[PDB]
Amino acid sequence: HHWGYGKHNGPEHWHKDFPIAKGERQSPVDIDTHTAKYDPSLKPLSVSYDQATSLRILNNGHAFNVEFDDSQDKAVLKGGPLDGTYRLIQFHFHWGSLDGQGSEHTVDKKKYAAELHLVHWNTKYGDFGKAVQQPDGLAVLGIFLKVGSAKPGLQKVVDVLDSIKTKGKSADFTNFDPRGLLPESLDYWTYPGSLTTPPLLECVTWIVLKEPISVSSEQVLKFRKLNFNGEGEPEELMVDNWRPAQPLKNRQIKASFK
Ligand SMILES: [Cl-]
Ligand SMILES: [Zn+2]
Numbered sequence: 001h002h003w004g005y006g007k008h009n010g011p012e013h014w015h016k017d018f019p020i021a022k023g024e025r026q027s028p029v030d031i032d033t034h035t036a037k038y039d040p041s042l043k044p045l046s047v048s049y050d051q052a053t054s055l056r057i058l059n060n061g062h063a064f065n066v067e068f069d070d071s072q073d074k075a076v077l078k079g080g081p082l083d084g085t086y087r088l089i090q091f092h093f094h095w096g097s098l099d100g101q102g103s104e105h106t107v108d109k110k111k112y113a114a115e116l117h118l119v120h121w122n123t124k125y126g127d128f129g130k131a132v133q134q135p136d137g138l139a140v141l142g143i144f145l146k147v148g149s150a151k152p153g154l155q156k157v158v159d160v161l162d163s164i165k166t167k168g169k170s171a172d173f174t175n176f177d178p179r180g181l182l183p184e185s186l187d188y189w190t191y192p193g194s195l196t197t198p199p200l201l202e203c204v205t206w207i208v209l210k211e212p213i214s215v216s217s218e219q220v221l222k223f224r225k226l227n228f229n230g231e232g233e234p235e236e237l238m239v240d241n242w243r244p245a246q247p248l249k250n251r252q253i254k255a256s257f258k
Contacts (some may be wrong), residue, residue: 003198004062004228006236011243018198025202026246027193028104031253036189039254045186045207046079047141047179052088054176057160061167061228062197063092063241066157066176070121070128075178077120077139080207080256081190086120086139089128091178093117094196095223097239099147102220104196104242105208112144112212113220115242116181132195137203143183144212151215153180158222167230183211187257196243210257 003009003017015021052075056067067090068075075088095114096102103112118141121131131137156176163171187210194202226238 005241014198014200018200020194020200020202023194023200023202024249025192025194025251026200027196027204027206028106028243028245029191029193029248029251029253030106030109030245031189031208033108033255036253036255038258039256042081042190042254042256043079044256045077045188047077047182047186049075049088049177049179051075052176052178054173054178056170057157057164057173058170059164059167059226059238061230063094063238064161064164064226065090065092066173068178073123077118077141077207080188081205081254082139082207083136085123087123088118088120088178091116091118091181093145093223094242095145095220095239096242097224097237099217099220101240102242103144104245105142105144105206106245107144113147113215114145114223116143116145116213117141118143118178118181132199132201132203134203135192136205138195139205139207142206142208143181144209145215145220146212147217147220148214149216150219151181151213153177154215154219158219161222161226165225165231166227169231181213183209183213185209185211187211187255189253189255191248191251191253193251210255 053069
């Protein structure tokens, strides 16, 4: 009985193995755009992904991750609400069975078709595993996807998904440029929160971009052909791998824009 997204092991069950599921700084949340406070002290984000080195793509049974070489300061995020330099380690997505759901964060209760997470860790802590134990250990860039026109920069990703259909499969995935996934504007909301999968550690500064990117219906359809299960086991389609919005409790969402 490992956690997942089904009826018997899904997010409303996670608290039994991970009591921090009911904590004070759980993610994701609904971003109420009228209640978010403009904070003119927030700096622009600085995303330096020109030297990024992708290595590999892996189906880990909950999502697919694209992994980057984080042994040096090659793809980093700084600025915004952050102090110091955060290195990119992986990205992944959450998506739905239908185009009207899939995102983890919502905006005035609006759900998007999917959500991209670019996960970065604070270099002062030396490695990813030490970083997840700290309140300012991680910074996740969240980007909403809506269905419309195709995103050329994502096509490379969707074309290898056939080679990692089932849990545990990996494939070489070099020379992928994550700059092709960014929107035009870098305006954002930010709030302190958590990983949205177990172990749900409260170590994340969330930076959620206001402007979604567009993907085509055909592109998101290929995500939905992946499997939660391993090879040879009964087929369960990897769909609806998103955690519902959690209570904001004592937190303020700040916006970089008015
Ligand atoms: Cl993971
Ligand atoms: Zn995620």
